[PDB]
Amino acid sequence: GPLGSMDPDTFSDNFNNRPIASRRNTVYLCYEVKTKGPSRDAKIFRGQAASEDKYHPEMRFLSLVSKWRDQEYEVTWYISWSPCTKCARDMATFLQENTHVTLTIFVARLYAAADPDYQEALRSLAQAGATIKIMNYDEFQHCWSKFVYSQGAPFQPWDGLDEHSQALSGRLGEILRHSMDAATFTFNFNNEPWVRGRHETYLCYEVERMHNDTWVKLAQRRGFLANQAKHLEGRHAALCFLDVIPFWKLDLDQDYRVTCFTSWSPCFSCAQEMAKFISKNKHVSLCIKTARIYDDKGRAAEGLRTLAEAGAKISIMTYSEFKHCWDTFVDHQGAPFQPWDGLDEHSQDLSGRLRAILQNQ
Ligand SMILES: [Cl-]
Ligand SMILES: [Zn+2]
Q: Which CATH number is associated with domain 182-359?
């Protein structure tokens, strides 16, 4: 097509929320810029470019929003991938230094590795005033209508568009709120021994340092994550937490206690991975408190025994732990933790079964 446009194939490649993994680090940015004001017939100034690290044609919109008399500017992005950590930091700085510019960002996909520094950069960009949302049907259709040379072809949505948009919206909310949804928590941490539909695994985590004779909490370091799925390799939540750990830059000469609240107790493979990790990280004492014992087709008891042998403290979550994670990691907005029926009974039964497991029976 014409210069400065994308063809249907480039759109289908970049602006799509199906499990396309990632791989080709192509980040396509469509941008609109409008003069802020009451005009309803205002002229929208549009541009678009794929990310290229030599000349960066995607940032040419910045020249459009320089200070000019009393003018203010509203910028809109339709970006194929969430902005990287450094670009998010830079745009936060820019919004701070250019209060005459405001910015909305619609995103097609989120990077699966929502690691701590990236999440803090995204929350930084949000606090600077940016509006970040996941693209749904309206945004995809608008981007097709405005930035694609289609030759009379109407926008054709793919099958699982809305479901993927909703899942990405939930993840983005988990990131920006720094807390998980109340329905999500209430469901994933239900401690009935045998359950259906718990396809995900949620892992909350806290860190403490030994100062004087006291475990002091490092509130700057608490957090939560979930597993990665789809079939693009599925990485369990325990492995993702192990990946989070090195970002903390712990002092190898200090003593730390690391607590994991998991909805599913670790599978055999994850248990061996965490045993190997703690046997090579002497400065870290691992506590594992699980809502449910994931039997892992009968391989889990051996893994839990291995992990306990390596020094980890494996326990079953009680009402106190559920209430604690509700207060600490759930967007409750003041609401108290409302326990489900049979919580205590399921908890004490699971404690008995874990006891039988650890003593080898
Ligand atoms: Cl697992
Ligand atoms: Zn696992």
A: 3.40.140.10
